[PDB]
Design a protein around this nucleic acid. Sequence first.
RNA 1: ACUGAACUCCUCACACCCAAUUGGACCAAUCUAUCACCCUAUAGAAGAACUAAUGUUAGUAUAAGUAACAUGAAAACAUUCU
Lengths: 108, 166, 290, 148, 152, 304
Amino acid sequence: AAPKNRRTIEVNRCRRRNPQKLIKVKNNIDVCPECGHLKQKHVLCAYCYEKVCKETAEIRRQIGKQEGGPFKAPTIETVVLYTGETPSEQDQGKRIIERDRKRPSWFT
Amino acid sequence: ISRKWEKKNKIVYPPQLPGEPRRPAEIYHCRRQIKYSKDKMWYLAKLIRGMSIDQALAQLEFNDKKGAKIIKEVLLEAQDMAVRDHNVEFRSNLYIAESTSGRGQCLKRIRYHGRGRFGIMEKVYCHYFVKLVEGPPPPPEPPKTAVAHAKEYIQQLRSRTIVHTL
Amino acid sequence: SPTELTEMRNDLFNKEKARQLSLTPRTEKIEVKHVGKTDPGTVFVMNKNISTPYSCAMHLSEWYCRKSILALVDGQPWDMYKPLTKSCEIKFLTFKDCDPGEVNKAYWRSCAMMMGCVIERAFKDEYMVNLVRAPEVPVISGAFCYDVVLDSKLDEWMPTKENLRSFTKDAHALIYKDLPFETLEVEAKVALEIFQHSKYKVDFIEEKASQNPERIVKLHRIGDFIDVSEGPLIPRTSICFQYEVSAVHNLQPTQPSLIRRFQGVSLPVHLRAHFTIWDKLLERSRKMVT
Amino acid sequence: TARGTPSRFLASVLHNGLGRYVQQLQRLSFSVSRDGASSRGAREFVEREVIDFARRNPGVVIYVNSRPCCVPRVVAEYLNGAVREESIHCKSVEEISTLVQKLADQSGLDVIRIRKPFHTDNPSIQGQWHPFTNKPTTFRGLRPREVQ
Amino acid sequence: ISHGRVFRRMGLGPESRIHLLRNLLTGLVRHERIEAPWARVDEMRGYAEKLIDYGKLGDTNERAMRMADFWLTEKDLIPKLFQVLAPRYKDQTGGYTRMLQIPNRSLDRAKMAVIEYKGNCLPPLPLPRRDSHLTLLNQLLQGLRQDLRQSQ
Amino acid sequence: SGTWWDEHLSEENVPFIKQLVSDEDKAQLASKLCPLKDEPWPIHPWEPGSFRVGLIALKLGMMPLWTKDGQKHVVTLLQVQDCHVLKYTSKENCNGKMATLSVGGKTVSRFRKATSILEFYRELGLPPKQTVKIFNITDNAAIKPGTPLYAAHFRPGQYVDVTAKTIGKGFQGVMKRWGFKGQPATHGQTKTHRRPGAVATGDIGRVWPGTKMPGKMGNIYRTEYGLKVWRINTKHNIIYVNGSVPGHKNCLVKVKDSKLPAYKDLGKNLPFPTYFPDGDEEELPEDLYDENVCQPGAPSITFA
RNA sequence: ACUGAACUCCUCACACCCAAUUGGACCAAUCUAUCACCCUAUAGAAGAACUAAUGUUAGUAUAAGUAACAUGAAAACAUUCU
Ligand SMILES: [Mg+2]
Ligand SMILES: [Mg+2]
Ligand SMILES: [Mg+2]
Ligand SMILES: [Mg+2]
Ligand SMILES: [Mg+2]
Ligand SMILES: [Mg+2]
Ligand SMILES: [Mg+2]
Ligand SMILES: [Mg+2]
Ligand SMILES: [Mg+2]
Ligand SMILES: [Mg+2]
Ligand SMILES: [Mg+2]
Ligand SMILES: [Mg+2]
Ligand SMILES: [Mg+2]
Ligand SMILES: [Mg+2]
Ligand SMILES: [Mg+2]
Ligand SMILES: [Mg+2]
Ligand SMILES: [Mg+2]
Ligand SMILES: [Mg+2]
Ligand SMILES: [Zn+2]
């Protein structure tokens, strides 16, 4: 079917600008106590998560170097190590991954 | 094309006498030719329309719409220049005075329908405008009380005249 | 007469504040470094005896001002609205901090202050109200308390539940006004000019003057009411969201002079409890605390 | 049109007629040209009428300018401070004279719709009607269906 | 009408549904932590937990081997399942996987969840942490607890 | 900002608060198990024209039940859970011909309830109930608020009316909502198989109000009239009622005496104000049965 | 008895309510001759006036932010899987 008459600006302005079609204010925002950036509650801090994922990205890169080719996932557990630290007695008998930097504060 | 909004930052007022209220600082800023619909931009403009800078940046951060990051940029640019050039003491004590989107210049392409028929498609562009006023944001007008309704009704009855006499 | 007394004390407070303001040669730029976990190495170039931790906060964001309750200046608790003295390291303290020990202490100290404020102006002039002090009480204890001496006429007089609800709404009114807790640090003498009428405040001032190597004492003003405090307070009254004056208890060895310990419990706006949980907290504050 | 335009109530300046009548026209400013047909009609108005007109009403100050112009005009100023501009242009001496008379016998109040024709400051003598005029009175002022 | 419909329709049909979930599961086994759309993470999550229980049955179980064969596409992960993952979760009876909501995807604006098997080698996810016991409210509640225990 | 009850509680306090509020609901239920002992209202003997209070029951599920004639009757099971009297309103105040009794249902959490409602229940001294329904009663039927109610309130042979919200089928088409025939599947029939027909007559330039057309189906109150009560389990407070009852399982129904003309004056022998177990006049057995019902654990039925 | 028109009277004013058609009094703007000289005069000329042709060109609306369109998965982005 086809419109029988042009809708006026006022009619349209009532459609468009009612509270239903408006953007609602979010009330669940907070400050990330860790980094001090803004995070939504119920959601992980975007900054903090990026930080983790950049670290874990590099760890996965070192995993590839040592593994060296597809279909070579080991049958032991894994541990990650940084500059100036040694595997414990219980750490013995599992895969070691080395690093060229200091251990992060948040990663313990 | 007109570019009035830019020039608004070049207005110089003469120095105030010590016996005067401290004039709020005043920053006008915009972005032109945003590839986004002007009416779509309106909703985001309308949202931040009366809030403080930080509170607007907060609201804009978690907003999913495309233009939301664009407005965030404009606001941060405006805040930066406010402190640097417009002699604003604190960056936090700014609120959005007016937030407006205009139609920018548009192009026309063709859309190919069935049979031989076609239509004229428009690559939509728009501008965004903002104004920042130094100081705490204005407290919203309180909702009208029963006593206020009553008060004004009394006023209204008292305004009656005997009509079409001397 | 009390109505003239209150305004007299204000004029005296104001003139000392003006005196302390005037001895500052124009403005000296002090440097303050942010030693917080968040946004590190920020340096604020502040006015010497003008700028506050609040002013530093409001350089950063509204999130600081909204959720900053105390300051550490060289690792000492410091009022939000207290003007600085010298270059230092500054960090801000919130309620949801890991160790909010200092923050909790400051909160209760402030609530007790405003309870004393509302009690003073709750009774008619024919009766005598005498505020003595607010003792230091652990937050893990029932509630905050202020000790009061009333008139000999009201020796038999015990407050009813309706009277308690009356105080409740009265203190609530104070919160609604949203009054900043102005602070002033002075020598003992000028403070004695402020409080010479009540001996119960005279000796308390003398106590603070003696314990400190200098004669420095802290006076906290909430709009009009001046009171002697033992440490830093909360910035504004709005911080409180729930506030009920729970009970009044008579102390036992009070044959020479009766002591009435007013007790009430409060929670700040950031840490608000559900209806049921607050109710059980009121129950505990009804118990006499030592 | 009445809705489409503003309105006023009937008035005078400072209760004109009450004590003594005061002519409201205060100043007249005639702009004429030495040459050119537009000002021709006006030119001979200054030949004859201006002089005797000025004698007739000593209250009005008349200024004649005599400078080049394509349209001759007259600026009427009133006591209250209204300014009325009228382009005499190509008008005969007689119809210019009628204009200048029409200006001189009016006030500075604007010509819009004038609502009521009549204006009283004391409309009643006996007392304005109210619902308790011509309604009788009761014993002890008792309302209907009173208990006692 | 669809009350108590448990599984959510996903791919271009039930076969595809399984196939997507199997791919997700394969990834998670290998890498131990994976970002994917919130619905799909939630959907796959259950099958991930059920896989550890089959893994707990051991190499010797022929049924469990056939299951692992189907659900792991890499075939090198099957030893890892049985000799790494199953031994790791010996104590716990359940609750091997954790899921969290992270910021929405940039391109798509989709809800995104990270899922990880617990006790992995990787850097730990920023996790929601309840406020300290020293907070004003917690101290007042600890006060009430003291009252009740010391009353008797 | 919005705050729920857990926002600011440590891991140590959470279990403590949970157990504390659990204790208090148990304590509040414990207090009110002796209605007659606590100062009650006058108890009036039944006279014709009188109406008593009802109950709020949860629908557990459905079962078969057998009669001696050998016929199978399906029964629905209704469990009376934490049913209490809430408020009494006089005939004057309610602006009705009958006085009114408020009855509460399934016990629910305090943390998810409204401020004022929490206040109301505090004054009563009972934990918050999920549903509330109002019963129209005569003056004699008045019961002091706080008084618990039991399934033995009803007895076998009694007919009841049952109202609940029906099962919600959301936006439905005309065919499943109104049982419209629809159009054939073959022989042409282009894109019309389940469409409503002609809506209205052409002469009228509108559509009559209350016409049947596609819309939201179910999720509305409906009552089933004159359901016989076959059986009462006194221990679990189970009512067994004939046939089908509206709404899903684990929903709350309102059950009262039947309104139908046939059973107008049948309330003579039925425990008038309510059944009071604390009275100890006669201790009611584990189960109560109708005459016709075949007892579980009775010898196999012969038609001899 | 009263109410009740543009009829009639009243105070002023008077060319100032028919289609096609016919007669008449003026006049916007433009150019020319001569004036004028913050926008006019007297005449002579003329592509000399648009609320309407499914008019022709350009711009922007309505329908409408509607219909419609689009990228297999995970990841070290090496690779692998469906
Ligand atoms: Mg073609
Ligand atoms: Mg278009
Ligand atoms: Mg799909
Ligand atoms: Mg069919
Ligand atoms: Mg066809
Ligand atoms: Mg078909
Ligand atoms: Mg008439
Ligand atoms: Mg006539
Ligand atoms: Mg006539
Ligand atoms: Mg001409
Ligand atoms: Mg033409
Ligand atoms: Mg036109
Ligand atoms: Mg057409
Ligand atoms: Mg058309
Ligand atoms: Mg046209
Ligand atoms: Mg549009
Ligand atoms: Mg539409
Ligand atoms: Mg579509
Ligand atoms: Zn963070």
